[model samples]
Target chain A: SGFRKMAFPSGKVEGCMVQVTCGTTTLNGLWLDDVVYCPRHVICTSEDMLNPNYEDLLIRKSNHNFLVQAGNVQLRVIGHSMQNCVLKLKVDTANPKTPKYKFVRIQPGQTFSVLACYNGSPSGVYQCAMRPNFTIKGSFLNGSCGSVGFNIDYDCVSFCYMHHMELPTGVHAGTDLEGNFYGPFVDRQTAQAAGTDTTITVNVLAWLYAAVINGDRWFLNRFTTTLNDFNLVAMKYNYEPLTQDHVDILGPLSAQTGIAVLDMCASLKELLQNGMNGRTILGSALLEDEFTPFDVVRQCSGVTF
Target chain B: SGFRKMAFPSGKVEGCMVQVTCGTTTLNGLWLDDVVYCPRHVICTSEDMLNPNYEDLLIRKSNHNFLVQAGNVQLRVIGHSMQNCVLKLKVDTANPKTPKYKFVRIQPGQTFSVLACYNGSPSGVYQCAMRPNFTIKGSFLNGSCGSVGFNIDYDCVSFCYMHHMELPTGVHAGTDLEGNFYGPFVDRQTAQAAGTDTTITVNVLAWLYAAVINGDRWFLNRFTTTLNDFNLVAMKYNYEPLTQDHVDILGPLSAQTGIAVLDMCASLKELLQNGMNGRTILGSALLEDEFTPFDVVRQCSG
Candidate 1:
């Protein structure tokens, strides 16, 4: 029932425009010429005057035709991150041999449609492109720009730094119990071929020597033999050396020496053989101070920081 | 346990590499080089080899370190519609000038990540851009490439033709209710802004004449009468036309009349006066019809 009389049968309606001024403020006026706003058609347009810029569309138009003519279009930036960007809308209907005309604008998130009447083409194409006014990279929230995002599916997991997984930084240390470290992380192919769990193995000896120099052994070996191996016997073999038979010997050693018990692989031979502190490894900070080889591991493990 | 012991720490572990055998048709020991297998990390010094390219990776090093030696790398292409598009990643660092770089690969509806390592600087920035590899006018999706896509939040409401919203070619009768018939679209503005619920005193006489000439008096009056009455009845005497009310009226007209109903005040008058025969107006079919002026309004009263 709410209908208004207009000049034509068409939905587009425009009237005499006037400039209004109140003190120092001026009201918004229709600056674009020939803009036909129809309810059935959602008309979008860019101007040639300055640059066609638009923010959140105040009105939603759909299923209608729009005619736009701009005298001096001023593309006022809308989005907070839009700066130094130029949005463009280009159209083409001719064969490949002809020169293509491209109309560019500086509007972000705006679309363009074919103007069948204006261009005199029965069929045509229109495309939109935009260069933003600004892009704030490394944003924390990613619904718009400058936010990090990540996605994963049945096969691969991908992420954008802005909205994806975080970059693991600094240096963190953990016990070499799992030995799963170095790698081109094993995939299905490697896992299938090696009946053994295809895990990236960390060179514990190299890491242990490094740990001693960094003075983090108290933390590094906190779960190892200190509490269990009270009489502390030296490491014999490497890679999964723990067995059930050693529990009796390990239990007594822990009770006597106030050390912890564990069932892990033997220490790496390379660390003991080349260590500055010589063959027998010691847990004391005083014993590690003079070792040059131990110094290398400490230096490498702490990271450049 | 299925296991193989490597005599040396760095070599081709037998099970990791599959051998390609070309039956008896071709027989030569050249098969040694044809042994297809993934290799271990060994620093091999070559005079000319600097970089190589993979469909999903710009291989800078053959070693174990997946480091960005130089140039922005490739990431996987994920999601539909981008089958013919190229995706690139850019990094932004704490140092605004230089950010780390890498490439990623993705399948449709899938996601991937790129490691933009800022080894040279403490912090960096990253971003993605798309380039269309298909369509005319270089149909870009939404990335300045006329790119059209939807995140999970996009409703069907906002979906639009990137470059297509025009009427099809040739003359269409305004008779086809569903036809995208335009109008004598806009009318010349008259200062009818008086009265509280001021009736927009449309000279129904002229509209009746036009409708009579266009063949259906029932259509012209039936369409406009209810529409006009609705406007007057719903609006407060001195109230401005509500867009919601206007939309409500227009929506049914669009459905019932099948003539793309609109609110284009600018072109409305033009449709009434001169647009019938014009392709951009009411279309050509309505102008050549045989109805008369009085008949156009038919038996309706407003």
Candidate 2:
């Protein structure tokens, strides 16, 4: 009734898309593992989502979609031809039965970076890396270009440092089962002490503000609120199309002091990097077809060969 | 939590539509008052629904869309101009707070028949009649032609005779709150005693078979199963498309016997006679905009 654990429905794409109906009683939204969207109001559209005053007529004001932030994902490949090649990757492929990501075709020097939510689908638990699953074709098999192999680029950047995958607990911070560390790194010194020697490349808050300006309205709200902790809030509790005014409103309420905190946690650039991307920050409520599952980070991973 | 009551979300448009999500738990389908769809596989499409080989590729194969049969609804009018007019009606208006139905414009010869489900929606509790809510549009004032008034034609027709609306209870049969009687009238005599004197104008089963041949695949599965009282069944449990061949299978398994029960019920013609249209009978689980909320009965209420 309040916030009970909802098991994924059994059918095509296990835990991919679980649908629930309401008669006299309902669950406002959902609770995926620890990410709680309880007491939510879904503001999705019928035809598509929104950003600015663009295509106002097509949007079917609805409260049906749910949210789950998969965090940010970016991809880069070396030694590729001008010829277009496809990349087939999977999340948490350690299980083997997990489904592969969509066919990501890389053109010469293409940048893949941006925020990823289950894209409103079953945005699965955050993964340690985008494990490669390539199809052999000719001398060069897609972007990896044959023996080139795969590098995470900026591995699994996320809003949450803790998740259902964590093995060591009772402590405020620790690495998940895969040894990917999550915590509030107040500075580079603290991060290094945690064994996270990677340099912080980009602030997710900076990227979010850019997304708002770029017209990425869907998940902008929640991402901002979390970036500033609870001090700043979305116009709507969960999410909504954020205006520059909204960001400005937070300057005094949160952003003034939040920038340092954002820089402190800075996505930590996992050689490819990723989660609630909140009701408003990540629009996990959208249908799979409606939203792009991958964020496609534009910045290249700085891992040396 | 199988069959647990899922409360409606808190927001605008009230119980008209409710949303749910899944993680590791899901309810295969849903369960309303008496009609149970405990174990069902949803076969709905995106962009639109199905009828035949019509518009095939646009459909997305997803296990979504639940079903609720609001039975069938039909409306007829008399007098006034050949002018185009609008009808603003509401269901279960006795409560007052209930939202009104969509604006239905009626042309002179228009007939509102077919079947009604929550339309893959939050199809609300059924009512005895469609209470008129006139906004006063001059001399004609849409349908009813003003002084002409409203007639249910064929009041609320349904598959099963029992419902959450029933009253007087305990007996095998009884009348509900608006004195709307529900029970299997094996014969005309049984119907008359319940204080129901209306004539049986259309056999819901007959109408259903026609709907099948007409290519209304969404609710065909469950309706057929109930018409034969479980003896005959849908290809997929809950609901699916009904082929003429599937209908033919019932010739030996059920239709051969169940036709009489259907005739005896015969929608009993409320003179706006309706509920489960089942997981397969009516497609109630659809979103509000996706399906038609009202099924304007074409055949005039006899």
Candidate 3:
């Protein structure tokens, strides 16, 4: 219902802008209908539009200005310079059997969008193998400097993963020799590669904080008492501003806190409220990213040089 | 003997304090001469008197308000306030059941001193039974209005009481219905108590730091991470410098967060560090204090 967005009024550079969508703009023999519509003949703006619409809808539909859309909807993509952006499709970097790092660096400020073909074509059944051989597609949200950001949309089938790295003891009988039982998720190595989408893109906005009107409001959005609903961007704690301590270290929100402690709590709270499966982020594992492991003996040495 | 300090001018309140030997001093002698020198002597003064005259010391001792000497040196106590201070030992009102609270509180300044008798005529044993009791002794570094601080000293016999606070799962085989392990030292309850001179007073400095420092060093002194040795005090984490967020009705770190996922990690850390026979401060019991227990499912609940 809240689908109406002030379409960006004619604004662009050269070759860095376009649109993506699905459905048809033509009706009878003489070709009349200009607006896109989904199957039920509902206006493509139905929020539940079934087609992939990653396109520029302001231009005429007969033209190929807009590329891919979901089911039936006219969507727009506005951006400039996806420079030095890299799209990596890693296969098996851990095994060394077939170590691969497919890097694709785009020009500065150009939108380098990669539509993942793991399932099927634009609207087909995509599939990835079991032994850590899944498909990864990446695109850069061009920031001004060398800070290239990345975002992707995927509808996973039978997929599960928690943002926690270390599992509490006795939680699961893991394959890790250290007895670190990982839950229903892939390993840290996978998370590391998948999460390294955006660094600092040139002109893509250091963060989305200043782009939208109520940008600051988005930082503190609540998903549950535990989970924070964040539209991940360069800065912000999953939408909320980084904490003072984090800001002090990372520069400032809308900016740094280089590491992110997303709303794992909010997600866990949601699980409990929705009567879903339980997910726990161990304190030790959660802290792993922020600080080195808490070593008792070394800590007790009381010798800080 | 380094008991009665002779280097400093004695009987003067400037920087002198004395300890008395029980039998040697009169029942009425909580004074300097009768109380200060009967046992041993150590002296302090504005000037260091390394050597002293022993024989002449006793002769000059009585005339100089306070004096002690060896064969080559001498020390005197010559201040009016030094001899004017009145000492009164009274039972502590907070917890009289604990004998350690008997103290001597100075008037006006509220400066109190602690004294203990290790082993002599009045006391019985070298060690007293340890039980679940908290001893709170404080020093007004600058007097009451000056600075207010407290040091919580805890003592447990061979083991702490947490061992029985709903014993870890099946750890308790045939414990009493009240959940008493009797500990390895003295039973949880039923320990005799009477005036004893065998309990020696601990050094105020060492006692304060040892008890204050725990799970984290920040729990004690906080000048620098020069010592990352942080310990949780009282087994409970009390966030200090309270702020508006802490008092807010719907704050993230408020009571509600305690009932939510935040408690998971706290509980997990407790379970992992739950020790069975550790006697040190950072033992299982200490860890258990780190979080709310399962049965207490609602301390943070409605």
Candidate 1 structure quality by residue, lDDT tens digits, B221-244: 222323454445325332223344
**How well does each candidate superpose onto the true structure, as a TM-score?**
0.15, 0.15, 0.15
- Poorest stretch of ten by lDDT in candidate 1 chain A: A1-10
Top candidate, metric DockQ: 2
Against the native complex, each candidate's DockQ, computed on alpha carbons, is 0.01, 0.01, 0.01
Estimate candidate 1's alpha-carbon lDDT, on a 0 to 1 scale: 0.20
Cα RMSD of predicted structure 2? 27.7
Scored by lDDT, the top model is 2
Global CA lDDT computed for model 3: 0.19
Residue-wise C-alpha lDDT for candidate 2, range A1-305, written one tens digit per residue = 00111111111122122121112212211122222221111221333222222224213322222222221321111111111111111222122222322212331111121111112222111112110111111110011101111112222212211111111111122122222323332211112222212211122333343334333444322222244433233222222223344344334313423343232222211101222221222211211111111221211111100
DockQ pick, better of 1 and 2: 2
True contacts kept of each: 0.00, 0.00, 0.00
The C-alpha stretches of model 3 lying farther than 4 A from their native spots are A1-132, A135-305, B1-244, B247-302
Candidate 3 lDDT tens digits, A51-153: 4231332222343332323223233322211111111111111221111112222221222111111101110011111111111111111110011111111
